[PDB]
Design a protein around this nucleic acid. Structure first.
Length: 44
DNA sequence: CGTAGGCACGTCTGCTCGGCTCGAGTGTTCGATCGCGACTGAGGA
């Protein structure tokens, strides 16, 4: 979680692109929301 | 010769004691949120 916070908007965006997250969530460009989704995607 | 006064079982009576269940009552542990300070990207001076 702290590691995901360090990940920064640029690399978490690229990770959400890699997992196949839809472009709306990538688009909102909210780092805090993006990390919560990426943590959920990793948990899945 | 007869004829009424003492010995074994059977079943019930009653009290004592020990054990088992069971639920009320009380203390102990552990996840489930609440709040605080802080982390960390973010659009305007």
């Amino acid at each position: 979680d702290a590691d995901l916070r360090r990940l920064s908007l640029k690399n978490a965006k690229q990770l959400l692109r890699k997992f196949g997250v839809p472009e709306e969530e990538i688009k909102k460009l909210s780092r805090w929301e993006v990390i919560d989704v990426v943590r959920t995607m990793s948990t899945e």
